[PDB]
Design a protein around this ligand. Structure first.
Ligand SMILES: O=C(COP(=O)(O)O)[C@H](O)[C@H](O)COP(=O)(O)O
Lengths: 220, 220
């Protein structure tokens, strides 16, 4: 091992993408051991500020931002799904109706959050009331709250793929889910990508569908 | 239908406490269904602001803050430890020196993090240069990077697992580790705790000493 790294890769990704980006960083760093990587993980507001200040090589976001000279490339599905404990009575039920589901307590992200609005918007179309027991601003906090028995959640499928994930939390088979959403690679269009970043972007675009199969992203 | 405990409970905790606090709310609410609980998860600057504005009943942080009239209750040790993959050559080695550890690449959190600054200060105290090859802003990313073979990390004990996931990490026996850090519940001392807050605090102390007993080892 060497102390000085002839090249650097600066990434900033939306919080939920923390479960997926390291699956690329790992094999990339094994191929190019002379690179040091910096990875920032933050919400949409944080990422916009970093783009505004031009801090990183590459950004991973859900929705492409307005007001910036950027190139945007979709690369991966981010489906939102119903999550609960494996011990829940509905855990193994097939085709759970949205009515049987609405009578369940939920732990969701804050109002105005992407996942929260999707389930609220969906619950509006069937004129049903969503029973919100607790509002948490963190994927990890929500999953901890589920295993404490406080109810079910709507989370991105990628929160189920933590390293060493166990069958203790599981995706529920529910009508109207998964709700399709996408992740995009974003970078400033005014300046050319560095060689390291361009090499990583190509890897991300060519390698992500292999990983999508290995973690079994639902195409639903 | 006789609930002796009804009230409002407002909690605010430092980010790392998302790994132990939200899972406790579940059984607490199952025991006291008449208590309405809100939980805010934020960083140190955010938490300090909330204490200043008197927004919550109880606050969970590591080091007690300066400049506030507060009562402080210790409740859980969350020590910092060296972790690597089980297949690493050092995995089963006894009494690894910091010199020996310093030849390895490290995967750490960003600057300003508790784990990063503790590790930088310790290695500086032995005039050792820490090879931080990957600076990753997420424990989940760090754990994947470890399992990918990219090197070693420093994490707090309760971050070594996550809700529904037990990655195959191994704690290394290393001189200068574990670095003890104590977590505290704090509340303004000018006002008596509300009945519900005192009930939650008593619960938090009882369940944390349960966790402490479960991992107890001989100390000096
Ligand atoms: O911004 C967040 C949101 O929390 P969450 O990931 O729980 O949605 C976290 O700081 C990073 O994601 C890293 O979290 P971690 O160190 O736990 O991986």
């Amino acid at each position: 091992h060497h102390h000085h790294h002839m090249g650097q890769l600066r990434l900033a990704v939306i919080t939920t993408a923390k479960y997926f980006i390291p699956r690329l960083i790992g094999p990339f760093c094994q191929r190019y051991p002379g690179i040091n990587v910096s990875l920032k993980v933050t919400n949409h507001e944080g990422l916009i500020n970093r783009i505004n200040d031009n801090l990183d090589d590459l950004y991973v976001l859900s929705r492409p931002p307005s007001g910036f000279d950027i190139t945007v490339q979709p690369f991966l599905d981010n489906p939102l799904v119903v999550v609960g404990p494996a011990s829940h009575p509905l855990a193994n039920q097939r085709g759970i109706s949205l009515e049987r589901l609405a009578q369940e307590p939920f732990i969701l992200r804050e109002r105005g959050s992407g996942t929260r609005e999707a389930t609220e918007q969906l619950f509006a179309a069937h004129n049903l009331n969503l029973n919100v027991k607790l509002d948490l601003g963190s994927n990890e906090a929500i999953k901890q709250a589920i295993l404490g028995g406080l109810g079910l959640a709507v989370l991105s499928y990628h929160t189920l793929t933590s390293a060493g994930a166990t069958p203790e939390l599981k995706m529920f088979e529910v009508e109207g889910f998964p709700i399709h959403r996408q992740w995009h690679a974003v970078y400033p269009a005014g300046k050319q990508l560095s060689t390291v970043a361009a090499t990583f972007l190509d890897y991300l675009l060519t390698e992500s569908q292999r990983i999508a199969a290995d973690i079994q992203i639902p195409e639903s």
